[PDB]
Amino acid sequence: KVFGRCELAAAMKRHGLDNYRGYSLGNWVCAAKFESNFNTQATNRNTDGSTDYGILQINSRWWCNDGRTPGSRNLCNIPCSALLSSDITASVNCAKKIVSDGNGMNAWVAWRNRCKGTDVQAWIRGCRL
Ligand SMILES: [Cl-]
Ligand SMILES: [Cl-]
Ligand SMILES: [Cl-]
Ligand SMILES: [Cl-]
Ligand SMILES: [Cl-]
Ligand SMILES: [Cl-]
Ligand SMILES: [Cl-]
Ligand SMILES: [Cl-]
Ligand code: NA
């Protein structure tokens, strides 16, 4: 599924990401825009041979099992394919674990390089939330 911006904001708010560990909703929408272009089916291979999956580009080295990332953990206890669903529940629940892990949203390289220190409230402007 390719989400609309306000559609995704609403879905993420429903799931309790608004101000989760202090990150306002615009941060999450911004991250999703630059990680996946709001596309749940997005996949991208990393240099290390791991793969990033879904709307928040969650990595197979640490977080999900894709059967082909040697020496990897599966800390969200989920097949990576579950992160490509039109239902974002699995992605959001896993992201909550990641962002609680010590480095906050700095775990998302696109957030750090493209969203951090910018006016992220712009990403939810005009949305009925
Ligand atoms: Cl929308
Ligand atoms: Cl947009
Ligand atoms: Cl914030
Ligand atoms: Cl915001
Ligand atoms: Cl393969
Ligand atoms: Cl694996
Ligand atoms: Cl959803
Ligand atoms: Cl933090
Ligand atoms: Na893994």
Element (H, E) at 95: helix 89-99
Q: Token digits for 104?
A: 């906050």
3-class state of residue 17 by DSSP? coil
In degrees, rounded to 5, the angle at the alpha carbon of residue 104 between the alpha carbons of residues 129 and 26 is 20
Known binding residue 101? Answer is yes
Radius of gyration of the chain (CA): 14
Contact 56, 95 (CB under 8 A): yes
Ligand nearest to the backbone CA of 88: 7
Q: What's this structure's resolution in Å?
A: 1.9
For residue 52, indicate whether it is catalytic: yes
Q: Using CA atoms, how far apart are residues 108 and 27, in angstroms rounded to an integer?
A: 11
Ligand nearest to the backbone CA of 1: 7
Ligand nearest to the backbone CA of 70: 6
Q: 89 alpha carbon to ligand 8 midpoint, in Å?
A: 22
How does DSSP assign 39-74, residue by residue?
BTT-EEE-TTS-EEETTTTEETTTT-B-S--TT---
Our CA dihedral for 64, 66, 68, 70, rounded to 10 degrees, sits at 10
Q: Using CA atoms, how far apart are residues 127 and 62, in angstroms rounded to an integer?
A: 33
Closest CA to 32 of 40, 24, 23, 43: 40
For residue 35, indicate whether it is catalytic: yes
| 1 DSSP 8-state letter | -
In degrees, rounded to 5, the angle at the alpha carbon of residue 47 between the alpha carbons of residues 86 and 90 is 20
3-class state of residue 87 by DSSP? coil
Phi-psi domain of 81 (left: phi exceeds 0; alpha: psi -120 through 50; beta: other) = alpha
Q: 26 alpha carbon to ligand 5 midpoint, in Å?
A: 35
7, 18, 48, 52: which one is catalytic? Answer: 52
Name the fold adopted by 5-124.
Answer: Lysozyme (1.10.530)
Technique used: X-ray
- Strand arrangement, sheet containing 58-59: 43-45, 51-53, 58-59
Distance of CA 93 to the CA centre of its chain: 10
Q: Using CA atoms, how far apart are residues 46 and 48, in angstroms rounded to an integer?
A: 5
